[PDB]
Amino acid sequence: MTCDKLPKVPVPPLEEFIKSNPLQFAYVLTDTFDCTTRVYVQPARLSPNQAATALDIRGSRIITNDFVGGPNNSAILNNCTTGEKATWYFQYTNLNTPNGSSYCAYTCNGEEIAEYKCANNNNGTDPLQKQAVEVAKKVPNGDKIHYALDNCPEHHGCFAFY
Amino acid sequence: DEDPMTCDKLPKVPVPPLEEFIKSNPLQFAYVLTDTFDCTTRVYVQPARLSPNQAATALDIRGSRIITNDFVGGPNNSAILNNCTTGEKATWYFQYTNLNTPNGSSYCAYTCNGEEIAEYKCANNNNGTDPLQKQAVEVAKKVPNGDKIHYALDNCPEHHGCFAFY
Amino acid sequence: PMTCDKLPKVPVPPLEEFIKSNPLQFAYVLTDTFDCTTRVYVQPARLSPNQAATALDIRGSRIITNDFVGGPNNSAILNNCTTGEKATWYFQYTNLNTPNGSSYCAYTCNGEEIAEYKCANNNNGTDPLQKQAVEVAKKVPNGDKIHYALDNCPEHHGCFAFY
Amino acid sequence: MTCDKLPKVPVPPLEEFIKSNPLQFAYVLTDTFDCTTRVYVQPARLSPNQAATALDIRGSRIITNDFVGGPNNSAILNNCTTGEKATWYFQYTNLNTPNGSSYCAYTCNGEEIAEYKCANNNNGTDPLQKQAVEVAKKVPNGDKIHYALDNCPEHHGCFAFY
Numbered sequence: 001m002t003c004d005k006l007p008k009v010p011v012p013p014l015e016e017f018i019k020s021n022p023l024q025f026a027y028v029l030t031d032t033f034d035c036t037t038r039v040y041v042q043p044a045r046l047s048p049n050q051a052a053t054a055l056d057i058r059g060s061r062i063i064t065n066d067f068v069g070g071p072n073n074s075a076i077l078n079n080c081t082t083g084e085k086a087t088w089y090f091q092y093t094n095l096n097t098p099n100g101s102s103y104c105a106y107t108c109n110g111e112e113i114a115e116y117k118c119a120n121n122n123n124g125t126d127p128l129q130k131q132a133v134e135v136a137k138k139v140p141n142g143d144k145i146h147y148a149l150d151n152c153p154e155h156h157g158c159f160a161f162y
Numbered sequence: 163d164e165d166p167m168t169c170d171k172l173p174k175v176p177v178p179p180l181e182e183f184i185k186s187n188p189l190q191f192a193y194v195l196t197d198t199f200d201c202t203t204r205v206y207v208q209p210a211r212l213s214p215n216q217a218a219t220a221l222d223i224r225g226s227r228i229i230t231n232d233f234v235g236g237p238n239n240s241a242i243l244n245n246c247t248t249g250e251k252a253t254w255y256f257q258y259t260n261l262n263t264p265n266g267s268s269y270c271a272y273t274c275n276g277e278e279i280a281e282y283k284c285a286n287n288n289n290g291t292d293p294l295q296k297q298a299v300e301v302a303k304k305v306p307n308g309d310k311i312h313y314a315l316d317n318c319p320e321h322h323g324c325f326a327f328y
Numbered sequence: 329p330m331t332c333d334k335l336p337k338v339p340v341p342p343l344e345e346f347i348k349s350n351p352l353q354f355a356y357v358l359t360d361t362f363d364c365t366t367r368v369y370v371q372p373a374r375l376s377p378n379q380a381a382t383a384l385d386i387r388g389s390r391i392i393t394n395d396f397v398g399g400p401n402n403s404a405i406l407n408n409c410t411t412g413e414k415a416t417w418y419f420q421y422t423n424l425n426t427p428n429g430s431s432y433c434a435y436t437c438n439g440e441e442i443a444e445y446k447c448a449n450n451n452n453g454t455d456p457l458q459k460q461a462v463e464v465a466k467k468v469p470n471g472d473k474i475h476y477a478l479d480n481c482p483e484h485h486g487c488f489a490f491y
Numbered sequence: 492m493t494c495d496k497l498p499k500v501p502v503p504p505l506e507e508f509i510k511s512n513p514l515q516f517a518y519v520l521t522d523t524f525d526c527t528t529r530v531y532v533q534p535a536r537l538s539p540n541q542a543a544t545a546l547d548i549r550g551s552r553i554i555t556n557d558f559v560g561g562p563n564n565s566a567i568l569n570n571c572t573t574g575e576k577a578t579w580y581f582q583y584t585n586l587n588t589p590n591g592s593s594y595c596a597y598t599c600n601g602e603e604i605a606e607y608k609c610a611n612n613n614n615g616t617d618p619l620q621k622q623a624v625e626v627a628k629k630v631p632n633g634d635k636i637h638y639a640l641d642n643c644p645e646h647h648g649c650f651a652f653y
């Protein structure tokens with residue numbers, strides 16, 4: 001019904017995300033994360049805070065966010081370029097099954113969904129992801145959620161980057 | 163005894179298993195040859211589950227920009243890199259690797275243009291303290307075109323709350 | 329001589345005086361780049377329209393090449409043949425083709441600091457001008473890095489000046 | 492014609508070679524000396540043997556050989572890196588004419604030609620060089636002699652180096 005009431009599953013251990021690398025976003029809300037590959041990175045050896053990092057790669061450009069665990073099964077992201085914070089949740093995760101990995105994550109503007117990222121490495125075959133997206137679309141501002149992998153740029157010999 | 167004097171004669175150690183690189187992530191490039199790779203962080207990525215060739219990827223990240231290369235093993239302990247943007251191929255080698263020691267990880271890699279060095283990337287996650295890395299740089303600098311090799315992490319852009327990205 | 333910009337700037341000798349000095353070695357340099365290095369001057373190619381001369385800095389199998397032309401204030405403007413990058417060089421002093429051979433010290437500045445320093449000779453470092461020049465340059469900002477360039481160089485294989 | 496029977500003109504005085512500096516190789520046998528500039532250097536002041544040196548410069552790589560005169564109008568080259576010796580001869584020299592300088596030099600493996608180097612500073616217009624090259628190409632192994640200056644790297648503002 002509203003963004004603040006969506007499911008908030010536990011954040012999997014970082015190792016489960018690393019084992020899923022790289023993932024593609026099948027469904028997103030803004031057009032920022034169209035044609036985008038996600039790679040998770042462990043903290044640098046010398047990092048005192050030991051925050052992990054989410055990489056959102058679109059061609060030759062990249063958006064980076066450190067993240068740490070927060071209350072209520074949240075991930076708090078710190079944009080590495082702007083220092084902007086955002087509180088994210090997982091609607092569900094299904095990492096490293098015999099059919100690969102998927103998850104849907106979101107961040108809210110009160111009752112509205114501000115951003116939505118559904119990732120997978122199996123070309124969108126997980127039944128959980130289909131049901132998750134249909135739920136999110138009925139939340140306020142979820143009408144903007146759209147399939148993200150149409151009319152993306154041509155590749156030049158790499159599978160997941162371009 | 164005597165240092166190799168052309169790029170084609172530099173050492174070529176075995177390419178470590180990808181897992182050793184992933185456990186090193188992320189690394190910084192302390193010394194590079196062209197300015198393209200100044201202020202840069204390396205992240206290695208396993209092949210996509212659905213990739214047929216199962217090529218791993220090297221990410222070279224400089225602020226909001228990235229350079230990506232798929233790679234596979236080749237002859238003579240080479241890694242054959244495929245630039246994901248252009249399709250250009252390059253044969254790389256490791257001068258040495260020293261991954262996942264009790265003092266962290268370093269390596270130096272290179273690619274040649276015949277007897278000259280064309281690019282050089284020395285990475286570490288220990289702020290440059292591995293003695294292997296110091297000696298390797300001294301060696302590489304002395305091959306044709308190696309005088310361009312330089313310390314790459316001076317005067318880099320300020321951060322906004324992340325340790326290894328900006 | 330307190331700062332790089334105020335170092336002496338003697339006239340660039342005619343090219344033939346440099347050619348008669350060939351080859352030279354660098355006794356003292358600032359960066360690591362020109363350790364264990366031999367310098368050879370070359371006239372312009374017959375067909376070169378600009379008739380720039382060329383400085384060759386040779387270290388084993390590696391060569392660094394710079395065309396050069398005269399500039400203002402007794403400068404030599406070097407054009408790196410691989411990149412097209414320009415650098416303004418001066419001579420702190422020259423003493424070419426004496427009865428005890430040839431020496432000079434040359435430098436390039438980054439404002440008040442010295443960016444690179446090259447003292448060349450063919451007499452194994454015995455010109456008294458060179459000792460004094462080095463002492464002066466060493467006190468300019470960044471000149472603390474100036475060091476003797478010919479320790480522990482590679483072994484030769486039958487040639488005197490190249491390896 | 493076999494290599495051992497090619498002409499052997501007198502080695503010109505060093506100063507004639509210095510006056511021709513720099514030269515480029517128009518024709519060579521192995522690919523080592525493609526896209527290459529030759530510079531001759533007098534002996535170092537302190538060199539007891541007083542051997543001159545030939546510099547073969549291909550972009551950022553230099554090959555060095557000291558040389559001294561030998562029997563039969565030979566020049567004996569000493570590779571400064573490996574210590575390997577090789578007996579060279581001049582097929583002809585034509586240094587410092589009003590149309591510039593050319594020469595063709597060679598070294599043999601008995602009856603076969605092991606290496607060939609035709610230098611000039613006039614873009615290949617000396618008639619002596621044309622005839623010399625024709626002769627050498629008919630010697631055993633001389634079929635590998637080729638034009639050396641096609642598709643060479645682009646320059647960055649220097650005429651004879653790159």
Ligand SMILES: [Cl-]
Pocket residue numbers: 105117119
């Ligand atoms: Cl996400």
Ligand SMILES: [Cl-]
Pocket residue numbers: 271283285
């Ligand atoms: Cl690398």
Ligand SMILES: [Cl-]
Pocket residue numbers: 367434446448
């Ligand atoms: Cl100099």
Ligand SMILES: [Cl-]
Pocket residue numbers: 596608610
């Ligand atoms: Cl020759």
